[PDB]
Amino acid sequence: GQIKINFDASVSASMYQSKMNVLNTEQYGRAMWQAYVNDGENPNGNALGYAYNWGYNADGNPVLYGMTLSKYLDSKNTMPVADTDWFDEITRTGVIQQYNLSVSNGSEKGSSFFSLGYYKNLGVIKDTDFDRFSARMNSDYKLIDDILTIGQHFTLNRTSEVQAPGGIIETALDIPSAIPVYASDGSWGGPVGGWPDRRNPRAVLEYNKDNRYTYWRMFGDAYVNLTPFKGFNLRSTFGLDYANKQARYFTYPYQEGTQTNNGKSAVEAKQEHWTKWMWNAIATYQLEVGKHRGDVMIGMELNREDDSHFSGYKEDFSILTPDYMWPDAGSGTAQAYGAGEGYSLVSFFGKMNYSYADRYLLSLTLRRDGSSRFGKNHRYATFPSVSLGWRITQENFMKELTWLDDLKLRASWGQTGNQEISNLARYTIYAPNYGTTDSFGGQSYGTAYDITGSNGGGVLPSGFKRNQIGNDNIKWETTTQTNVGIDFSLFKQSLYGSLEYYYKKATDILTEMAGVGVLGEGGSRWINSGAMKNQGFEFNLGYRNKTAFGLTYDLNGNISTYRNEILELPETVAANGKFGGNGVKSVVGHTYGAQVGYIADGIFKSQDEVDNHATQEGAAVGRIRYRDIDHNGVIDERDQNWIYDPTPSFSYGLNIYLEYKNFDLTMFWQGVQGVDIISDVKKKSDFWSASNVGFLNKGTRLLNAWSPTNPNSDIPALTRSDTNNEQRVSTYFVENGSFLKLRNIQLGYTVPAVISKKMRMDRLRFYCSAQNLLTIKSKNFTGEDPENPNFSYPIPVNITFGLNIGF
Amino acid sequence: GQIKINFDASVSASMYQSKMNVLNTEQYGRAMWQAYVNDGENPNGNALGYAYNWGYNADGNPVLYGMTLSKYLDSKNTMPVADTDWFDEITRTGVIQQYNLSVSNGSEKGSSFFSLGYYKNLGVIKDTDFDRFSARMNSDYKLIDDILTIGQHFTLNRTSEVQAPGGIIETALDIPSAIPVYASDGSWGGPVGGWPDRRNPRAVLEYNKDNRYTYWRMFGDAYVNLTPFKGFNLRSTFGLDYANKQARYFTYPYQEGTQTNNGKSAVEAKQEHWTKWMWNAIATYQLEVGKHRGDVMIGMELNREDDSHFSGYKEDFSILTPDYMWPDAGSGTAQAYGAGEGYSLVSFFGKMNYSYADRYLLSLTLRRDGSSRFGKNHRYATFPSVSLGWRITQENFMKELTWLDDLKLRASWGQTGNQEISNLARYTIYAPNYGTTDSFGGQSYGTAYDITGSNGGGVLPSGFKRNQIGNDNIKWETTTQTNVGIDFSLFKQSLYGSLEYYYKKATDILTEMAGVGVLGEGGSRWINSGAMKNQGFEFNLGYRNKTAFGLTYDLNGNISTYRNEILELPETVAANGKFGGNGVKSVVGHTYGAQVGYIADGIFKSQDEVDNHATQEGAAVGRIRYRDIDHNGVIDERDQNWIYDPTPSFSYGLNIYLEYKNFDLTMFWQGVQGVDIISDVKKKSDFWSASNVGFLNKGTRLLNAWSPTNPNSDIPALTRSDTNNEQRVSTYFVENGSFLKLRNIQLGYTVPAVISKKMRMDRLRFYCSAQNLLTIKSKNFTGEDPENPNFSYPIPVNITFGLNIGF
Ligand SMILES: [Mg+2]
Ligand SMILES: [Mg+2]
């Protein structure tokens, strides 16, 4: 019988703390010089306009005395030489702001709830942004007071956003610092001459800045609940989730140095729809007879989702503005795209709960799930569970232990299914694919051909191509799971804890698996392939207690270990290497994702060390010496072994909570100890040449590369050629990825009601919080963030200020 | 403090009662014969396969003895001769079904409402249908009990429909009965040879049957209401109306006799969006001092609507099914379409109500409206009103008249604005229009041209074309309105009535007005053009009374008259004829839509009657004699006068309501007396040749056309040529369109609560209703429905059965 009102608001800041340091224009000039003289080549013959003052020292070893650079990169003086920091140029402080206002009404014969919210992100990446209006409104109505009840939930979201382009950050670390942001006039800068065929990342963002989608989503449900006698309940629910995304993606002409669009201009008007509806019926019966308590429940749930998308594309526009650029206004050619897919799910289920004397618990569970992603012959799968419970401390013989409030012992066994696969997983798919979609450097795989020799100017004849081969025998991936647990609490709920042991084993694992080469186009197949096992230990422990000095602490920890192992694999998949082993060793009996590769044994420091080692092709002074695993006297494809295991030795987490003088302080720490990580980062930071495209910007670790002048370094000598195949899977790319970081720290003041209800307001609280602030890494880790070792940039820190006023 | 529940359900039937009777295969054969011999032509030389046995009578006049027809229409025997009734073939009984379930909850501190509804129409036209799911959910919350209130309304509709093709019915009355529905095998029938180039209407529906749109609409509003002291109120409202329509329109190959697609196949995936948001603030203050009562109110309202549509079109599909036919799967050419438009409205307003002694009322009103459809120089317009009231019977001197409960006298004066015009009304619009949209028989008006002589096979150069000429001086259409009223009630509310008099005059009327020919492409202009006046009389009268014999009657009538007149018109518009006068006389001083034309003076019955009449070109025996209005001795373009006025002499309406033994009977009658109507219907019913396309099916009135054998008939002699220009605007097409019809009759039983609350249900009512059942027309009207004289088909009757159970 109340009416309650909450209002929450906050503003957040997001700032990139660090990044992979990449070479500046002089360091880039120094590095290329070193890679030149390391190869006995005239460094003054470079294609990039650097002029080097150098010579030989007293021991006859290249030393760089000085270097000059043109004012402009090109003879025509349209592009000036720069020292651009591209990462700082395309990033900025993100700012987030949220406001939520809620109201609820409690009444004898019903209830109703209402929320309005707003959320605006100006992303850390320039020319991006995001906003979400939201409204939720729910209610219930007690007819036939307490035997027939009707209700509803509903929410409604409008979202609009300009997403960044994929890989925008990495391409900013890739483009050299000599290229300026702006040309000699005010146009967008770019590469001239031999500089990399990579466009201006800032200019790419500006050209992206108008590509904004508008996303509308509603989802709710309506239900009736019939209670015909004391313990019985019939409930039916109908659900609906309809969203639609709309956007225009604008293509504008560009011509920035050698980069060019010709004069292309186009617009694509994209539309997407997703409608998902759900229905269930459920019958539950509870009953209590002195000691015995029992609950039964049966149900059913039909699910459907229908998807569809489609677009219109058209080229050539007189006026390069969003106002002008609609398909009606284009004068060049047009393409029309679009398709749809869908899936349906039937679900039958039941449960049975029983408890003798709040001392012995037992629960049973049974579920048939059916899914249109399989043929009739595997459409349904049935999954049971048994869960068992013994509350020791309730037992009579446990009377004597007063320092033990609870000691529960649970043991479970259950199966669940995996079904997340393509909606066409089971089909051999032939698509017409005439060749109307963009694609890079070729690779249309179009079926249209000028069979007459016309040279075009019309509809070509065309046909069909294969996208995948079907599977008449594709079935559910089944996971059988077993865990036994011991949770407890001692003293007077001051020392709570739990010790669990789980053993999950997956069977008939589902993967889209590619095909063999000679089978050719569209050989990919959706298959059930082998079995995995994952068993481990979890052990959470807590300590909560006040100090009677004004302080409450509540310290909650968690440490876990797990080991993982593949058990069976079709012979073809094991040599393929999908699950690990890199195509040289089968990963059966090893952990999922473990890798075989060469072992990097340092750097040859003398020619004698080259001759004194098994013969290997690129072996030379300054190169990486790779180990002769089998001792045959040559380094070839067999000189590989297991060199990477993703299994951490353990993973932990500790949560500190303090209340004192109405202040409150919270810290969330999470750690991972003794874990291999594997990365390509080092191919950009440690090599001038470990890359298919030349003259890209590289990391700053290069300037400590190996040299006669610099003889005791892990980093191989700079070179313009990867003759030694140092891009080979090797321990050079495996690093100690152990870490410990503060996910969140947060301090808040709760305003005492003596002063807050001043304002006819119950609660009023201010909080300040910070995410991803601190990280402690291994010394021999050389990346940015060990938890995400593939990235050359970290997660940005967030500072937030907020209030939770509450009437 | 309640909880209330209504449930309404009904099923309706819709059946076309009558239609313009069109010729059957023999009547069509008879008619063409008559038109042949009437022209002294060998009727056996027709191009349609009829063979006629005929000759001359005793007086030497053609008489048809018999006629035969092939078994098949074509020499190759693929199309059999038929007597198809096409109207019966493409129509059926429509059935409608609605179900609505509502629940509301009233509580001290708030309220909430919830409705679910369903509506399914299988239309009277085959291969059409329509359905609407709907959910409404509203609620309010009394914070700061009765000074600060928060609320919300929201509704949500999903609609899906296959619309009929435009003019499907008329084309079924147009295609001759000799063409069969099915070919000799099971394919779709069509015309062969000389038969009209019109496709099979049934086959058109089947090809349309999969073109289904899916329409989602939500609209609601959220408001806060602040009442700071006793009479004051601040209210703000935010509103939102977002709908989106989605569809695929399928083009399938056809080849039915001479009708052909070649082998065309295509799909168009169309998308539309309409988002409309609204915001207002309003401040109201009420105050009462003994006799004086006064109310003031000020406010503001911003409005915006943004629209956008776009599609993708693609030709050529291997599999002619909706499952297959998405743009991705097409192999032919593609087109991309789409655009957007929008408008915004600002609105400032105020009102002032005052009443002395519930004897004298006065209200004032002021509103500035601004609209982005005008330039800054006419953006806003200001509108006032004065309304005045005197309650006579409350006056002291009116004490003596007991047979007079009320006698109110009201008098008003106010202005409102018209603003419904194109969003680009004020612009000179150049569109690129390359020529990518379908168009009939040419008329692309594309700007693309093969300027090089290539003959195509590429993007052509192209340009811009004009759609309309702008108007720097376009302004609001203003309507000044004045009405004085006298409403009353006598005895003891048994004889209620009202007598009103209104005088609305519009100024600066807005029309898209075309341009002169020599100005050419895109000469259409949005202009303010002249003034109109519309003044009339309304007089409603009622009589309600029970009988004390178990019967209540409540009889409510209405009779109205109006006369309309144009006052000023730019000289160019008056000779144009947009508002009337057919380009021969100015309609100034006449009613809107009145027409000048020739006067049809019967039918020449002898050559002497032809010579004895002013010389007119097509004059011959059996033709229409047209009057020599000016007596110059020739019939030419001056022999015209005013021959049509749409003003009815009056229009009435009577409503009967009866309650008796819990039954209830309702009849709604509406009439229009003494009114001209004007129609083209007669060109299909009365002429073999009053049409640009030959050999179409015609009405059955032809078989009473004029002939020597049939000399006393209004209908001119059948002929293959309209030499006499009987398609000229003439009194032949003007008819007495007076009518009286029963809009609705309805009978219902209300179940007495003695038996209904049996079921814990308050009210339970059954009703049966019928729409458009009866119509009484003028004898000298020859169409189907005088109220809609352009159509050759009536409005179908609806029988409905329904219940209104109410807990
Ligand atoms: Mg070896
Ligand atoms: Mg004349």
Side-chain angles (χ1 to χ4, degrees), chain B residues 454-610:
Chain B
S454 72
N455 207 50
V459 175
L460 304 179
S462 65
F464 306 101
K465 89 168 214 269
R466 194 171 55 194
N467 292 333
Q468 101 185 348
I469 307 190
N471 192 335
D472 302 320
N473 205 57
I474 204 192
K475 45 170 149 190
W476 286 77
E477 158 176 331
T478 321
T479 307
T480 290
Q481 157 146 12
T482 283
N483 78 269
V484 47
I486 291 183
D487 39 350
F488 56 84
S489 53
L490 311 82
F491 292 20
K492 101 83 176 183
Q493 281 75 320
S494 77
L495 187 120
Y496 49 104
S498 148
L499 184 134
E500 301 223 80
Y501 163 94
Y502 58 72
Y503 176 114
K504 301 97 168 213
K505 141 150 163 174
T507 287
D508 312 309
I509 310 183
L510 288 148
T511 44
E512 178 145 42
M513 169 87 264
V516 285
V518 289
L519 174 72
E521 171 173 67
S524 154
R525 268 240 202 105
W526 275 100
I527 73 187
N528 307 106
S529 147
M532 254 204 290
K533 143 178 86 161
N534 209 94
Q535 67 175 98
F537 280 123
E538 222 151 305
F539 167 58
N540 319 281
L541 187 62
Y543 190 65
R544 48 191 166 198
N545 190 32
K546 197 186 184 140
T547 197
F549 141 70
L551 170 50
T552 292
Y553 44 72
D554 183 5
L555 310 201
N556 205 337
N558 161 275
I559 163 172
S560 39
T561 206
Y562 92 85
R563 274 225 66 99
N564 165 260
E565 145 153 39
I566 289 118
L567 320 172
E568 33 194 332
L569 273 190
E571 251 173 298
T572 62
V573 169
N576 176 298
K578 192 149 193 120
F579 298 69
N582 310 56
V584 317
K585 283 181 205 278
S586 161
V587 69
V588 166
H590 290 71
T591 89
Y592 170 64
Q595 302 197 20
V596 184
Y598 298 70
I599 287 177
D601 260 348
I603 296 121
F604 298 116
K605 313 243 216 274
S606 146
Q607 182 93 61
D608 273 348
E609 313 206 348
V610 183

Side-chain angles (χ1 to χ4, degrees), chain B residues 628 630-632 634-636 639:
Chain B
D628 186 28
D630 62 1
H631 299 101
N632 50 8
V634 278
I635 313 287
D636 61 3
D639 294 297

Side-chain angles (χ1 to χ4, degrees), chain B residues 621-694:
Chain B
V621 189
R623 293 340 306 162
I624 300 191
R625 171 181 35 230
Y626 289 101
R627 195 190 292 175
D628 186 28
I629 271 45
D630 62 1
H631 299 101
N632 50 8
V634 278
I635 313 287
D636 61 3
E637 296 87 5
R638 298 160 300 177
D639 294 297
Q640 287 178 87
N641 225 319
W642 296 104
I643 69 171
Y644 165 79
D645 193 325
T647 312
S649 180
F650 60 95
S651 323
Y652 49 103
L654 183 58
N655 182 75
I656 277 73
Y657 180 43
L658 311 191
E659 310 180 350
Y660 187 79
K661 274 72 190 201
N662 267 338
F663 282 100
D664 58 79
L665 179 47
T666 325
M667 306 176 104
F668 181 25
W669 302 79
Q670 227 158 19
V672 158
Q673 192 49 38
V675 61
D676 287 340
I677 50 100
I678 179 89
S679 198
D680 294 19
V681 165
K682 263 166 122 175
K683 313 190 179 154
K684 181 181 187 55
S685 46
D686 289 48
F687 306 81
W688 179 258
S689 160
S691 191
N692 187 57
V693 50

